[PDB]
Amino acid sequence: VAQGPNGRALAESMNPDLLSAIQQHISIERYASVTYLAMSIWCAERELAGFYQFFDGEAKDEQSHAVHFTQYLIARSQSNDLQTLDAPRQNWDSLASLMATAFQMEADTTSSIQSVYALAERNSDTRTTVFLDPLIAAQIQSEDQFAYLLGRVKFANGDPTALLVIDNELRAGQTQRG
Amino acid sequence: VAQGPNGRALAESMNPDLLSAIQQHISIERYASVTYLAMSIWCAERELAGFYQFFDGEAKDEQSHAVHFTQYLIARSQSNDLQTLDAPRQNWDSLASLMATAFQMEADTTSSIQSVYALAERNSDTRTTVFLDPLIAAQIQSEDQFAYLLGRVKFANGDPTALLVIDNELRAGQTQRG
Amino acid sequence: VAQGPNGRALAESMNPDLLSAIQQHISIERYASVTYLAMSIWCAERELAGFYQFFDGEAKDEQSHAVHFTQYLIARSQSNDLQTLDAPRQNWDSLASLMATAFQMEADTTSSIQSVYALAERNSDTRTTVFLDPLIAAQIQSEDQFAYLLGRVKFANGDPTALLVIDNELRAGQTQRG
Amino acid sequence: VAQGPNGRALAESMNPDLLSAIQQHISIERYASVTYLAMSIWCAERELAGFYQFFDGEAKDEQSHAVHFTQYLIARSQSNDLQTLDAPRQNWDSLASLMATAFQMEADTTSSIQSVYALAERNSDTRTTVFLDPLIAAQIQSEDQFAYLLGRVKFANGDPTALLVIDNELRAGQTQRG
Ligand SMILES: [Cl-]
Ligand SMILES: [Cl-]
Ligand SMILES: [Cl-]
Ligand SMILES: [Cl-]
Ligand SMILES: [Cl-]
Ligand SMILES: [Cl-]
Ligand SMILES: [Cl-]
Ligand SMILES: [Cl-]
Ligand code: NA
Ligand code: NA
Ligand code: NA
Ligand code: NA
Ligand code: NA
Ligand code: NA
Ligand code: NA
Ligand code: NA
Ligand code: NA
């Protein structure tokens, strides 16, 4: 029995390019987390309490997704490498603009997973494509969700009354098409 | 065992300046109470039933805070001196203007406590700073709350529809960022 | 009514030095969080599942403490400024060495709060000293806790059997003197 | 409607190489089962009752996994071919050595599935890759589990006290990082 780079028994070696890609993806999700935290603060600063609560939860959920990846590396007997985290964006001119960045962030998170997925396929790492499959499924749901929130906010067309209505929807947990 | 000015056994004498400051602070909170009553009436007069209910409760709560201070003086064996209460403001041009006065009233209430706090520190009255600590903590929450209500009302920008939505929020007990 | 730097109604201006100190303290706690995450990974890599679970929870709790500070700034109508997060330490020669760093991290977190506290006292910011008081109280408990965990691990003197026993204690939630 | 080789209606023909690979994989899992039975006996012979119980359950679970594959062949209207089963290994010099073989057995089971998976991809048999996906997911968990058990036993470094502690963990059902 061989030992992996993190010292645990090694079921199957991992290509160093694939390892690096996963470690960077973990950074992407950690960065998405602090971005959603930044977005929650922006919403709180404008009394959009429902949006604040929503993004506070998204930040915690994205961090969980990141930790889920660190557990996979542990499971594969690979080393983790927790990286420097950039500061998030913190200023937006409108809620519509914030939601556009949020949607883009979710889509970019999926692109990162897709990048890791294709590397794993090239390396015939079937453990990793299997591991990623449900995360892609969740990303589809999140993209559908954030398209819904962005589109609904854009439909409001900057009217405060409509944005207060949506804010209250979010506070109630009405965050998807359902 | 010595007797305090109110006739009870005296654990520790209180500086007369500090006593006067507390007695005046009690007046401040009694005045905040009748102000919130005035504000509840203004809201009722305009069918803003949620705001009416909110301010009716604030008036009762502020009175309780005032009585809490009278109990402290009793506990310190100091005399109370319930003072003349000025008439409150009773006219505003808009709900936004009313909420501005309400926010200012809460902040001014905190300033009064801060004034008492600094006097107690000068007099090394640790009973009094300890007694005031949780009241300052509550004031932070109230300031955060009234900033939320004021900001949300200002966001409405005088639109009746938005103000009816917020009114209904208040009736439901949705009065903070949460 | 004046507006604070984050745009909300301003109950009382905050000195920019104090603001900066709080913003940096938020970074300290965010850094403590990712450090505990790093520590949880190290423990998982060595099959110390109880220590892994403990530090996984500490990481989430420290993040919550950080967010609690961001809410205070919101409450004070001050701007947040979420900063770059350094990479954590990730390598230790022994569990005893890891626990030493963990203890030091908790103590350094308290020192940071103490630094903010003294600045607030200089500025007579009683809202902030009151806000910090329960956090200092929690830090005392955490320091007592981490002294217990470190001392118990040191008592084991590197014996694997003893460390497995303690590991199982941690998995069960036995993490303090009780 | 055509009939498959086992006589049932045939939804889609299967390449004979892929069929043979699955039939041999069934043998692999049947062999893993009897190996874990052998391992349970070795542990029972040395009064390691927790390890005995663990491996007794693993043997039954591995047999279930094997039968799950036979059901897939039935579902695909393909013939099963239950093969001669070799005798398992039955002697080890230490629990650490036994656990090394167990870990290797789990990893080799995954390699067999990976081999079948790649054959199915070459044959564009999407039913089979889909069928295998959750089994690969389970194998990741089992590899993580057996790395944990092996690493924990190795950490004990042959000390009977530590091995008794771990034995009791296994009897309680504490068999993973959790
Ligand atoms: Cl908008
Ligand atoms: Cl951006
Ligand atoms: Cl208005
Ligand atoms: Cl006025
Ligand atoms: Cl140690
Ligand atoms: Cl260090
Ligand atoms: Cl051994
Ligand atoms: Cl062998
Ligand atoms: Na902001
Ligand atoms: Na980054
Ligand atoms: Na009136
Ligand atoms: Na008065
Ligand atoms: Na490590
Ligand atoms: Na940092
Ligand atoms: Na204090
Ligand atoms: Na035997
Ligand atoms: Na065989």
Residue numbers in the entry:
A (entry chain A), B (entry chain A), C (entry chain A), D (entry chain A): 5 to 182
Structure paper excerpt:
Their function requires the transport of Fe2+ from the exterior of the protein to buried di-iron catalytic sites, known as ferroxidase centres, where Fe2+ is oxidized to form Fe3+-oxo precursors of the ferritin mineral core. SynFtn, isolated from the cyanobacterium Synechococcus CC9311, is an atypical prokaryotic ferritin that was recently shown to take up Fe2+ via its threefold channels. The wild-type protein contains three iron binding sites: high- and low-affinity binding sites at the FOC, sites 1 and 2, respectively, and site 3 located in the threefold channel and coordinated by the side chains of three symmetry equivalent Asp137 residues.
Crystal structures of SynFtn have been reported in the iron-free state and following either 2 or 20 min of soaking in a 5 mm Fe2+ solution. These revealed conformational flexibility of the side chain of residue Glu141, which is located close to the inner surface exit of the threefold channel. To probe the possibility that Glu141 of SynFtn acts as a ‘transfer’ carboxylate with equivalent function to the conserved carboxylates of the animal ferritins, two variants, E141A and E141D, were generated. The structures of variants E141A and E141D overlay with that reported for the wild-type protein with overall rmsd (for main chain atoms) of 0.10 and 0.11 Å, respectively, with the major difference in structure being associated with the side chain of the substituted residue. This is the case for the metal-free structure of variant E141D, while conformational flexibility at this position is not possible in E141A. In the case of E141A the second-order rate constant extracted from the gradient of this plot was 1.1×105  m −1 s−1, significantly lower than that measured for wild-type SynFtn. The data reported here demonstrates that transport of iron to the FOC is inhibited in SynFtn variant E141A. However, the effect is less severe than that caused by disruption of the threefold channel by the D137A substitution that led to loss of all rapid Fe2+ oxidation activity.
